[PDB]
Ligand binder design. Structure first.
Ligand SMILES: C[n+]1cn([C@@H]2O[C@H](COP(=O)(O)OP(=O)(O)OP(=O)(O)OC[C@H]3O[C@@H](n4cnc5c(N)ncnc54)[C@H](O)[C@@H]3O)[C@@H](O)[C@H]2O)c2nc(N)[nH]c(=O)c21
Ligand SMILES: Nc1ncnc2c1ncn2[C@@H]1O[C@H](CSCC[C@H](N)C(=O)O)[C@@H](O)[C@H]1O
Length: 258
């Protein structure tokens, strides 16, 4: 058994209140109140549609992914990553695809900076559509489960999916819903040998998930990067400040790009 698995049982054993307190203990949060109120009226200018943008900004503002040219965002939901890339200096084109429909988030049309570069469709199932050429691949797909084996099945589908989309020296940031299961480690190692990058933990992630993102401009041993984060999450069980710490949202400008 891996350390991640020990962690997952310990999580599932928690009571309802302890769960909600642990989930946000000492993590990082985004001040979203005004951005949401803005959107809940007609406002289309300045706001991120999701806390997803803040999440992507963390990776980029550090040069772990450098989106550019033709960007594909698989499972883009409301559009938080897409709209975010739409205003980055080098990015030429953003295409985003999702499920939508009853029970899922629909794309939300916005006029943030570079909105014209960005094209979103719902009703799409990414697993059965032909791969297209591109320069940067993004993917935030993975529906969590109480059962880590289910999670590994779901994650290995996402991995086989992105492989088919990956070229040569293309930029990427790909959610790995479950990185600790033995079968995922293996696929990740084979994938690292063939495309590079490594796994990195985002501090905006909640303690209730062990997700790590495969980003292109990083290195590090797969096994170590993973165990590091299991030990962290276990350390966080007995924590003694028990509060999230907030940071401002992203302003995404307004207007068309060229
Ligand atoms: C809501 N919840 C989720 N988790 C755990 O955290 C992981 C992700 O949980 P989440 O809050 O991020 O939920 P998710 O993003 O999937 O969306 P949603 O809240 O809609 O789904 C809740 C899922 O948690 C499961 N769940 C609900 N209550 C429990 C529980 N008491 N114990 C274990 N699993 C639970 C549900 O069956 C459901 O699949 C899950 O794999 C599960 O082990 C919980 N654990 C405890 N111990 N008590 C909980 O109340 C709880
Ligand atoms: N098989 C599939 N094909 C297309 N979209 C899928 C999919 N499975 C899940 N998705 C969608 O992908 C989305 C990932 S969550 C979107 C978060 C986004 N990065 C943001 O910043 O807002 C979910 O809304 C889900 O409905």
């Amino acid at each position: 058994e891996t350390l991640g698995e020990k962690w997952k049982s310990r999580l599932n054993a928690l009571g309802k209140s302890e769960f909600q307190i642990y989930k946000k203990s000492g993590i990082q949060e985004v001040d979203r109140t005004l951005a949401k109120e803005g959107i809940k009226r007609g406002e289309t200018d300045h706001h991120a549609v999701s806390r997803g943008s803040a999440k992507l900004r963390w990776f980029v503002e550090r040069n772990l992914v450098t989106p550019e040219g033709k960007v594909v965002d698989l499972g883009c939901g409301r559009g938080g990553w897409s709209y975010y890339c739409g205003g980055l200096k080098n990015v030429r084109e953003v295409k985003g695809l999702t499920k939508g429909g009853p029970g899922h988030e629909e794309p939300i049309p916005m006029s943030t900076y570079g909105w014209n570069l960005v094209r979103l469709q719902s009703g799409v199932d990414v697993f059965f559509i032909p791969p297209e050429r591109c320069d940067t691949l993004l993917c935030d797909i993975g529906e969590s489960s109480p059962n880590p084996t289910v999670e590994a099945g779901r994650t290995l589908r996402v991995l086989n999916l992105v492989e088919n989309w990956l070229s040569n020296n293309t930029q990427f940031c790909v959610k790995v819903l479950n990185p600790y299961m033995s079968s995922v480690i293996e696929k990740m190692e084979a994938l690292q040998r063939k495309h590079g990058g490594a796994l990195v933990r985002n501090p905006l992630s909640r303690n209730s998930t062990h997700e790590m993102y495969w980003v292109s401009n990083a290195s590090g041993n797969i096994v170590s990067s993973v165990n590091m984060i299991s030990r962290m999450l276990i350390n966080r069980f007995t924590m003694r400040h028990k509060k999230a710490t907030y940071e401002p949202d992203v302003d995404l400008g307004s207007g068309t790009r060229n």
